[PDB]
Scaffold this active site. Structure first.
Site, PDB file in Angstrom:
ATOM      1  N   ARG A   1      83.301 108.484  29.802  1.00  0.00           N
ATOM      2  CA  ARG A   1      84.014 107.380  29.169  1.00  0.00           C
ATOM      3  C   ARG A   1      84.153 107.767  27.704  1.00  0.00           C
ATOM      4  NH1 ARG A   1      83.994 102.168  25.563  1.00  0.00           N
ATOM      5  NH2 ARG A   1      83.147 103.855  24.273  1.00  0.00           N
TER       6      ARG A   1
ATOM      7  N   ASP B   1      84.984 107.148  23.997  1.00  0.00           N
ATOM      8  CA  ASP B   1      85.010 106.061  23.054  1.00  0.00           C
ATOM      9  C   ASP B   1      86.092 106.222  21.977  1.00  0.00           C
ATOM     10  OD1 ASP B   1      83.571 103.707  21.470  1.00  0.00           O
ATOM     11  OD2 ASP B   1      83.724 105.413  20.098  1.00  0.00           O
TER      12      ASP B   1
ATOM     13  N   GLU C   1      88.653 104.450  25.868  1.00  0.00           N
ATOM     14  CA  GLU C   1      88.712 103.114  25.335  1.00  0.00           C
ATOM     15  C   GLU C   1      89.850 102.980  24.341  1.00  0.00           C
ATOM     16  OE1 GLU C   1      86.636 102.017  21.963  1.00  0.00           O
ATOM     17  OE2 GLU C   1      86.117 100.014  22.666  1.00  0.00           O
TER      18      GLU C   1
ATOM     19  N   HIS D   1      80.551  95.216  26.196  1.00  0.00           N
ATOM     20  CA  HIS D   1      79.702  95.085  25.012  1.00  0.00           C
ATOM     21  C   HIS D   1      80.427  94.744  23.720  1.00  0.00           C
ATOM     22  CE1 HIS D   1      81.436  98.953  25.469  1.00  0.00           C
ATOM     23  NE2 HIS D   1      81.124  99.300  24.230  1.00  0.00           N
ATOM     24  N   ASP D   2      81.746  94.615  23.781  1.00  0.00           N
ATOM     25  CA  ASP D   2      82.531  94.290  22.597  1.00  0.00           C
ATOM     26  C   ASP D   2      83.280  92.961  22.722  1.00  0.00           C
ATOM     27  OD1 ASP D   2      81.875  96.618  20.983  1.00  0.00           O
ATOM     28  OD2 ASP D   2      83.110  97.761  22.387  1.00  0.00           O
TER      29      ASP D   2
END
Ligand SMILES: OC[C@H]1O[C@H](O[C@H]2[C@H](O)[C@@H](O)[C@@H](O[C@H]3[C@H](O)[C@@H](O)[C@@H](O[C@H]4[C@H](O)[C@@H](O)[C@@H](O)O[C@@H]4CO)O[C@@H]3CO)O[C@@H]2CO)[C@H](O)[C@@H](O)[C@@H]1O
Ligand SMILES: OC[C@H]1O[C@H](O[C@H]2[C@H](O)[C@@H](O)[C@@H](O)O[C@@H]2CO)[C@H](O)[C@@H](O)[C@@H]1O
Ligand SMILES: OC[C@H]1O[C@H](O[C@H]2[C@H](O)[C@@H](O)[C@@H](O)O[C@@H]2CO)[C@H](O)[C@@H](O)[C@@H]1O
Ligand SMILES: OC[C@H]1O[C@H](O[C@H]2[C@H](O)[C@@H](O)[C@@H](O)O[C@@H]2CO)[C@H](O)[C@@H](O)[C@@H]1O
Ligand SMILES: [Ca+2]
Ligand SMILES: [Ca+2]
Length: 686
Positions: free
Chosen positions: A227, A229, A257, A327-328
């Site tokens: 993943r 970032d 992301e 988480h955001d």
């Protein structure tokens, strides 16, 4: 192996990912916990370490918590070594518990574990058919102040213990010294710092080579996916060259992301997903799901629009990773809300196209606002929650019903509050009915489906007040009432006779790399695989089975190819498109053209003699180029992925709409480096 095996690192469409904040999951080894002011065993101070580690994860994998849920992949915090400084942000002490403040990409974060623990994590996981995905954040190192070098670790970058450089007195220029982004433009958010995070300069060979080397370490350690970032904050050309490094070595499913806000639809986002070699976290999907099931700021027609739109916008919509929170964002579940909202959104996500990701704690109805309240320690490992059971009934369908993993999506009935959709792939069908109205039942008449005549039990067993479906001839369902907050899943599976390609990965690589083609109806005897018109058979097809084929990419000219397969009897499959054959290994090169004046709305582009450059097709030119940060108009620049060591001819163009103006003169020429980066500076020829 079949397309559904844990060994399949190229396809995650039949999996369900469980996102874990390592620190907040389970402390299986107290011996590695941070001490002093950087630690809080009670986990009441959410910006300090709470002690969760790899051992803990291994423990939950072994005690059946995860497997019991039906989860088949776990996505963990960035495993690399983080800074050790406690950072005081105006009175509040902050630790790197999250794992996003990297100091050395070739080492582990000791609070999580040793490389040994990591190898153990992969083995235990793999032993239980669980794939392992790691977060990877190569955009920056850590918070640094170039003038206050005593601040934090000054964003120091180490190469396996060896100091490469720091933010202050960056003579090598490993970082960007352009200020901080205001997220004003895409170019602005890429070449400037993310907050105070020391922005790495991918155009520096040292950084370029070091990061591509680090990822290989991890790939060599057995990870199944990555993943990425902050992909919206690194150059796209560099990232493509990075994805080419992975794919050309040991391909694994990579997704990045790219944050999208509510009602935001970005064409740059689409282009990135379609051309970078990697897919994305489906922010479009998530924002829409929240509006519809959580905040009630849009209705079923909005969800439908998002579904049909995304399917048109993304070339491979099935590779987009869906979620309802992370988480955001605030946790989907609000303390006072009806839990049925979270349950339905879970049922919807699990049965929808793409790769579902579940944020740890969701199944436990965790509530919490933004960072760090959305990162509390999981309060329990109970399997007795309704959410846990919904996941447990639906997760497995992605493995047993290819309609859910690869099928198309189709609205069959709809109103403000109700949405009934059908997934279909080969001889497999799944129909899902959702009624978001928690107070009003709905009368469903006129529902038509692809289900064969007969009766269908709700796969959820009435858990969410679903019901049985009665399908007469023509797949027409008899009238029924859909309970308030009702959710039901009905399905039909049967052997598929003709070759049907459901998935291909990686989507981009150079000749000789082995790709995986997943689907149904391939038969058991080797057939033929076609890349455009080139036929491949015999030895280069390393494995062939009903649901999976592994084949080496023929040495064909770089470019975009359609893939088709034909079984042994010569029956052809559907066409899978957008496969990119690279010209060779890739390098990131920065192109700069001086004095290229344009009119407003008119942009400069680049094209050239190789497929990585469009092959002289303006419709395929690279751009538009940038002209704000690194160089300013009328000087333009752009970071592009080009085949290493090749001598390439190129030219620039000014494009307005589909109207194009060529640079005069003769082609510029240059030979790409064998590794590391380079910068080509030329003047626009009138
Ligand atoms: O001080 C360091 C902080 O860094 C950490 O934040 C991470 C996130 O957890 C990542 O998931 C990711 O997310 C970023 C995202 O990349 C970035 O775009 C930004 O999003 C903006 C968006 O661009 C803009 O369009 C608009 O919609 O606002 C968004 C913010 O809601 O922010 C995301 C989150 O920071 O990358 C960053 C950096 O890697 C860490 O989580 C923090 O605790 C830490 O303080
Ligand atoms: O019967 C085929 C027809 O079914 C669906 O239409 C629904 C509609 O969505 C409901 O809102 C309500 O009006 O009942 C109709 C059933 O008669 C499909 O949406 C439609 O496309 C399809 O033709
Ligand atoms: O920043 C990108 C911007 O570049 C171009 O705009 C030029 C314009 O062409 C010039 O005539 C002059 O006014 O400076 C601008 C650069 O700031 C493109 O025309 C424009 O579409 C693009 O957004
Ligand atoms: O079509 C392939 C061809 O494209 C480019 O030629 C441009 C030329 O540079 C322009 O000045 C103008 O005349 O349009 C041509 C496109 O037809 C490349 O320069 C050339 O090498 C290539 O073969
Ligand atoms: Ca620990
Ligand atoms: Ca950056």
């Amino acid at each position: 192996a079949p397309d559904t095996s844990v060994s399949n690192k190229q396809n995650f469409s039949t999996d369900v990912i469980y996102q874990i904040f390592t620190d907040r999951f389970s402390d299986g080894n107290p011996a590695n916990n941070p001490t002093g002011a950087a630690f809080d065993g009670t986990c009441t101070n959410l910006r300090l370490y709470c002690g969760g580690d790899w051992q803990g994860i291994i423990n939950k994998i072994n005690d059946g918590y995860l497997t019991g849920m039906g989860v088949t992949a776990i996505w963990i915090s960035q495993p690399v070594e983080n800074i050790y400084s406690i950072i005081n942000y105006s009175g509040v002490n902050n630790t790197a518990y999250h794992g996003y403040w990297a100091r050395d990409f070739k080492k582990t974060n000791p609070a999580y574990g040793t490389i040994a623990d990591f190898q153990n994590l992969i083995a235990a996981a793999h032993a239980k058919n669980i794939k392992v995905i790691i977060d990877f954040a190569p955009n920056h190192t850590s918070p640094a102040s170039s003038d206050q070098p005593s601040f934090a670790e000054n964003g120091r970058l180490y190469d396996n213990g060896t100091l490469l450089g720091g933010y202050t007195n960056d003579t090598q220029n490993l970082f960007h010294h352009n200020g901080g982004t205001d997220f004003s433009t895409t170019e602005n958010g890429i070449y400037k710092n993310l907050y105070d995070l020391a922005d790495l300069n991918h155009n520096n060979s040292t950084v370029d080579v070091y990061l591509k080397d680090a990822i290989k370490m991890w790939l060599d350690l057995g990870i199944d996916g990555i993943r990425m970032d902050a992909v919206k904050h690194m150059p796209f050309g560099w990232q493509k060259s990075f994805m080419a490094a992975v794919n050309n070595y040991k391909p694994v499913f990579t997704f990045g992301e790219w944050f999208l806000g509510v009602n935001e639809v970005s064409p740059e986002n689409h282009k990135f997903a379609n051309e970078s070699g990697m897919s994305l976290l489906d922010f479009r999907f998530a924002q829409k799901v929240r509006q519809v099931f959580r905040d009630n700021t849009d209705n079923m027609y909005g969800l439908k629009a998002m579904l049909e739109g995304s399917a048109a916008d993304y070339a491979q919509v099935d590779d987009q990773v869906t979620f309802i929170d992370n988480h955001d964002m605030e946790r989907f579940h609000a303390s006072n809300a009806n839990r049925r909202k979270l349950e339905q959104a879970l049922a919807f996500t699990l049965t929808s196209r793409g790769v579902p990701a579940i944020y740890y704690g969701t199944e436990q109805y965790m509530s919490g606002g933004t960072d760090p309240d959305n990162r509390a320690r999981i309060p329990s490992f109970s399997t007795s929650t309704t959410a846990y059971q919904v996941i447990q009934k639906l997760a497995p369908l992605r493995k047993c019903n290819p309609a859910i993993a690869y099928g198309s999506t189709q609205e069959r009935w709809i109103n403000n509050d109700v949405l009934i959709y059908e997934r279909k792939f080969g001889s497999n069908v799944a129909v899902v009915a959702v009624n978001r109205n928690l107070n009003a039942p709905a009368s469903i008449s006129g529902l038509v489906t692809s289900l064969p005549q007969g009766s269908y039990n709700d796969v959820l067993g009435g858990l969410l007040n679903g019901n049985t479906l009665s399908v007469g001839s023509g797949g027409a369902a008899s009238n029924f009432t859909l309970a308030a907050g009702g959710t039901a899943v009905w399905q039909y599976t049967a052997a598929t006779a003709t070759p049907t390609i459901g998935h291909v990965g990686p989507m981009m690589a150079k000749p000789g790399v082995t790709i995986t083609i997943d689907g149904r109806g391939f038969g058991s005897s080797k057939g033929t695989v076609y890349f455009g018109t080139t036929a491949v058979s015999g030895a280069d097809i390393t494995s062939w089975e009903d649901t999976q084929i592994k084949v080496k990419i023929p040495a064909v000219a770089g470019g975009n190819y359609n893939i088709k397969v034909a079984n042994a009897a010569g029956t052809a499959s559907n066409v899978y498109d957008n496969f990119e054959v690279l010209s060779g290994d890739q390098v990131s090169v920065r192109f700069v053209v001086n004095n290229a004046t344009t009119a407003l709305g008119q942009n400069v582009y680049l094209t050239g003699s190789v497929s990585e450059l469009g092959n002289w097709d303006p419709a395929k030119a690279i751009g538009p180029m940038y002209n704000q940060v690194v160089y300013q108009y009328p000087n333009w620049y752009y970071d592009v992925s080009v085949p290493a060591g090749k001598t390439i001819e190129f030219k620039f163009l000014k494009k307005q709409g589909s109207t194009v103006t060529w640079e005069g003169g003769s082609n510029h020429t240059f030979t790409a480096p064998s590794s590391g980066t380079a910068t080509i500076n030329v003047n626009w020829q009138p």
